[model samples]
Target: GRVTRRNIIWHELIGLRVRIVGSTHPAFVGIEGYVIDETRNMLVIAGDRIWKVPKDVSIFEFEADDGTKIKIPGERLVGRPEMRLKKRWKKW
Candidate 1:
């Protein structure tokens, strides 16, 4: 299967621009910034001031390298950084 399989579950998103499209929190709604860091359950957005947003209950819209935007659920991104570094497959 020569299909394009995205390594999303273990994807590296440290230096990409992102936006908080949906979330349980009120202050973080409509927030946007570059992902400065990532933890087991949080994402640090560096825009409109530094924001340590929750990843377990928020939706993130990240910009792709090709100028395209992709929306991701926070539940899918809540994990240790080591898990994303576990190499088995790759991006196309």
Candidate 2:
């Protein structure tokens, strides 16, 4: 229910806490850390080891510093970081 656009865009995603709640790639499931980087293809999580995880096939949960958490379908985030802000999405 907390899928508002306020925290769904790339601008809000950078530097937040992230976890791979679900994924087709088993290695990524349960991986958690602060988001340190983003690209058209993946997100880099600053964990025990740097994780360059593909955005597709992954369901992600983002936690704001204030403790707000939102789960998002990874396909919605598939795009260049710069393009993400302008991309249109159905209201969440």
Candidate 3:
């Protein structure tokens, strides 16, 4: 499984409210998430299902709670312009 904030999802002990006991700093900036796809800023929890947080939200690079800087290639976060903004929300 992908080693990231997402790991908390599977662990019942760890819920959406991550304490960040270790090197992780307490996210007081309201940085909340359950299954966090840090690469895409995709918060897959409260939304009822996995959802794209939007490019504006999806961050290719940022400092982790642990202060461990990281980066994700643009490709990993988004597919393509045509692939995104499909102008279709709820498919019938």
Candidate 4:
């Protein structure tokens, strides 16, 4: 099997399972769900009642479609899809 480095951009996160591991606010300490939508500054969780989490000051654990899990700093994914893909990210 090949070892693949995780490089997450905007599209990669949609429909991906996510958990809030580290956060600046106490309220979002352990929030978990699949990403259903996103904006420049927020990530929306799936459900009738939307939970839009801030894209800064938080670390998100993302489980990819292929079951590859990785933790990414939310700040790094803060941008439009095109821009996020082009931006260089540090290996985690």
Candidate 5:
């Protein structure tokens, strides 16, 4: 007879790429808004109040954008939280 067990584990990275999509707005000429959905082959960016850009197809859009554009292969997708809390613990 034998018994086996698996341990659930998790890891975290501070200032990961996912954080950029929603927060941290940089006024880089045409830069406006952004999103992280690699499954569609690019990130989404909005400019001014009139234009939307796709990272993969729009060379100018990608260049105009700031931060990092992580490569998304296949159809893997990461779910974004409704809201992210950048909270710090209080001192006792």
Candidate 6:
């Protein structure tokens, strides 16, 4: 299945292109790049230089596989990669 706006939050983010739409830190806004690495707190972006964008404070716009842009908040993405991948998804 392809990545949709609803499912993209739970999907793997590394290698997916992203841009920061909203963020607590003004400096982090509008930074766009492919995610190179991730941790519980940050997403390392391959921008002009490597940028470690904080997860909890930033909202993201990700490029879906089919070329659609989907927005997801950093709050939902603030977890270890393995932990997120294993968590069962339940729609609210």
lDDT of 6 at 35: 96
Cα lDDT of model 6 by residue, 21-71, tens digit: 999888778898999999988999998889998899899998877898888
RMSD of 4: 4.7
Screening candidate 3 with a backbone cut-off below 3 angstroms (N, C-alpha, C), the clashing residue pairs are none
**Order of candidates by TM-score, top first?**
6, 1, 2, 4, 3, 5
The model with the greater lDDT, 5 or 6, is 6
Per-candidate TM-score against the hidden true structure: 0.82, 0.81, 0.23, 0.75, 0.20, 0.88
lDDT of 1: 0.78
Which ten-residue region of model 6 has the weakest summed lDDT?
Answer: 1-10
Candidates by lDDT, descending order: 6, 2, 1, 4, 3, 5
Candidate achieving the largest TM-score:
6
lDDT winner: 6
Error of 4 at 71 (Å): 0.6
lDDT of 3 by residue, 1-92 (tens): 22243332222211232211122223322333343433322333323344434333333333345654334332343433333335224478
Note the Cα lDDT for every prediction shown.
0.78, 0.79, 0.32, 0.73, 0.26, 0.85
Q: Clashes in each model (backbone N, CA, C under 3 Å)?
A: 0, 0, 0, 0, 0, 0
Give the clash count for model 4.
0
Misplaced by over 4 Å in model 3 are 4-29, 36-43, 47-52, 60-76, 80-92
lDDT of 1 by residue, 12-79 (tens): 77888889999887777899999899999999889979999889899988887777777878888787
State the displacement of the C-alpha of residue 41, model 4, in Å, after optimal TM-score superposition.
1.1
Please write out the lDDT profile of model 2 over residues 6-83, one tens digit for every residue.
548645466878889999978769999988888887888988888889888899988865677878878889888778
Native-referenced Cα lDDT, model 5: 0.26
TM-score winner between 2 and 4, please give it: 2
Candidate 5: residue pairs that collide: none
Using lDDT as the measure, name the better of candidate 1 and candidate 2. 2
- Report model 1's TM-score to 2 decimal places: 0.82
- Lowest summed-lDDT stretch of 10 residues in model 5? 1-10
